[PDB]
């Protein structure tokens, strides 16, 4: 738990801000097609932040053209150029799984600023 810890500490990224589940943010992903380096912006609510160490991940959910697209990343990958933070939400959870349903039904369910 220590010997592994250091050899993985060698590759930790140490420039991204902190954030909890339930706050909008913007990820700049360095998607590649083979000859150019585009950058796609994918913003949404952080449904989940899981794991610890170099194996730490997190999930972002948005609603694009009706249907909702979830998308998870390893926090320390180099295919992410930066991470903005749009706003902060007030939630009582650590894993927001009730949002996967409160999308339609002619009622908008969003969080509150804190």
């Amino acid at each position: 738990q220590k010997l592994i810890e250091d050899i993985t500490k060698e590759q930790l990224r140490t420039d991204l801000p902190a954030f909890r589940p339930g706050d909008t943010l913007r990820v700049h992903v360095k998607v590649v097609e083979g000859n150019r380096e585009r950058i796609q912006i994918f913003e949404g609510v952080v449904i989940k932040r899981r794991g610890g160490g170099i194996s730490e991940t997190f999930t972002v959910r948005k609603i694009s053209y009706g249907v909702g697209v979830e998308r998870t990343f390893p926090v320390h990958t180099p295919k992410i150029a930066k991470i903005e933070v749009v706003r902060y939400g007030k939630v009582r959870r650590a894993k927001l799984y009730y949002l996967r349903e409160l999308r339609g039904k002619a009622a908008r369910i969003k969080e509150i600023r804190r």
Binding site: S64, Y65, V67, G68, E70, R71, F73, T77, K79
Partner: protein, 122 residues
């Protein structure tokens, strides 16, 4: 995990609204078919117009699934609905448009004509 007897919804203006799965194309097993596979399928529900009738055996490809799809660097993508496009037994679609997001494991196959008709690709 699309398998026999699944009911998918059609993601373009061909004339079908839902479709049922009759067979996964592949080897002699092939219980399951994830994003970017071709399926034999029968039209259950249809619109009054359209070029596709009710009760027809058509080819189809798969664009969205609830089951995710793992990528190279260990990143995942998921949706909340299964969706399909009706192939003409040639990789061209049998419609004109596409409705919604389309996955990215398509372009790595010969399905350029479909990813070129989508609003956006995630």
């Amino acid at each position: 995990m699309i398998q026999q007897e699944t009911r998918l919804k059609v993601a373009d203006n061909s004339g079908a609204r839902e479709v049922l799965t009759i067979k996964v194309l592949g080897g002699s097993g092939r219980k399951t078919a994830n994003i970017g596979d071709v399926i034999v399928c029968t039209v259950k529900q249809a619109t009054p117009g359209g070029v596709v009738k009710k009760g027809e055996v058509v080819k189809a490809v798969i664009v969205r699934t609830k089951s995710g799809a793992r990528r190279s660097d260990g990143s995942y993508i998921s949706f909340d609905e299964n969706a399909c496009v009706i192939i003409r037994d040639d990789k061209s679609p049998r419609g004109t448009r596409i409705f919604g997001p389309v996955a990215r494991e398509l372009r790595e196959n010969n399905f350029m004509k479909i990813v070129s008709l989508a609003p956006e690709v995630i």
